[PDB]
Amino acid sequence: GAMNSSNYAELFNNDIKLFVDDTNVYRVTVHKTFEGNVATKAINGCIFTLNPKTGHLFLKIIHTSVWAGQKRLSQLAKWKTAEEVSALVRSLPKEEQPKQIIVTRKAMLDPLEVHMLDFPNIAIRPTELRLPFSAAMSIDKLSDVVMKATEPQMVLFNIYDDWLDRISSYTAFSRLTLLLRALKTNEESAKMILLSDPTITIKSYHLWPSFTDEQWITIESQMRDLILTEYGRKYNVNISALTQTEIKDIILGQSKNEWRKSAIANTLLYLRLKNIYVSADDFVEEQNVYVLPKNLLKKFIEISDVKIQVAAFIYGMSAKDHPKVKEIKTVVLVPQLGHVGSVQISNIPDIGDLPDTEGLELLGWIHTQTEELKFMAASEVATHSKLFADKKRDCIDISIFSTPGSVSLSAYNLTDEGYQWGEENKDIMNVLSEGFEPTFSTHAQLLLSDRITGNFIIPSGNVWNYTFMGTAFNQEGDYNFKYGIPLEFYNEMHRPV
Hints:
Elements: E1 17-21, E2 27-32, E3 38-43, E4 45-50, E5 56-62, H1 73-91, E6 100-103, H2 109-115, E7 123-125, H3 140-148, E8 153-158, H4 169-185, H5 187-194, H6 213-229, H7 244-252, H8 256-266, E9 276-278, E10 289-293, H9 294-303, E11 311-319, E12 322-332, E13 336-338, E14 343-345, E15 361-369, H10 378-388, E16 396-403, E17 406-414, H11 416-423, E18 441-443, E19 445-449, E20 455-459, E21 481-483
Parallel strand pairs: 1-6, 6-7, 9-17, 10-12, 10-19, 12-20, 15-16
Antiparallel strand pairs: 1-4, 2-3, 4-5, 5-8, 11-12, 11-15, 13-14, 16-17, 17-18, 20-21
């Protein structure tokens, strides 16, 4: 079973996998020796070994000393790669050793297999993707250490920089392959994109410029721009006639202790409440005004996670002479399978059987996130459309962004463009947002208030976080509910036995 954009999803599950690229192993330069005579001398190379989940790059620098008088070097390069890749795997603890080792080029299959025979439960996979890992030398920081290299040496790198603090692995790898593919297409223009307004620089310990979550999107857009542009020259067919999958395919080449650590991290989320910022755009008196109880914010934060998104539904009502003042009365925590940058949410809850629900109107949904945007993220838009396209479109999106020291609330409505675009993308996941617009959503007037106080509705089963219980999570489920205090993200009732 080869790998293509079909099983592209599996790359990021909890099974260690390594990519191997050997395009950059055997390299030479047309260099003039003393006399002035021209001839190709061999220069340092490297093995592009990449764990796509954690972003760990095991770049093995291949010094030119190894090509010492060897015959037929290009043939040997494939066996010296297999040798070193094998050597690597064997040095990792049995827990860190991968399930699959995906090679970028067919010619690298056999050599690796031969050296990995005593490792049968470690598969050696080919790829029907012609990934842009060949352009790993574009990265000056890498290209440098390889040339700088004076002797054979194993150099470690993180290729996602610090992205994984904000976005998922899935989305991280996307951004990566997009960058590398751009460089592979037109290196100068690709770099020009990354290296304009020098106000945004690249840190020492980083390979990439320090863009904001908002800046990153424009960058990626400019990358797709640059890539599709020059695919509409090699085949010069009209680019604006591609279906999403085609665009996606063009870019690809078609410890119980770890648990208790992030749990502790969440016990500190409540501290971020001592500095609260509420997104204030310009508002018209024709707009509704949503007042959010501060206790409902305080608690929602406390039960949320530092990375993984936590979402819930919001209910409320109005008062005499002003239906435009929407009071949030209840937050409904529902069975959900959260991720990083997205959240799988179950259907709108059946709270009719509960008391005091009489008269409550569904205001929309509230959720947390790791990114920092002035607009609904592609994921949000997608989730919002699946939720309220048919039901109730005047629903709002209360987006909570949290970071050490402060929280940041924002309310959004979704234009008919957004709802419509959210349908034709039931589930896309990021860095391929061809059709996405920041103006898909507009600001909704939100106010926090310790002048009113709301309550919670929880699943009658008490559990709501199925992130670690994915198998026992029915999204179409017909769940029953009840009032009660919601539990923490890493509550011992949320962990797999």
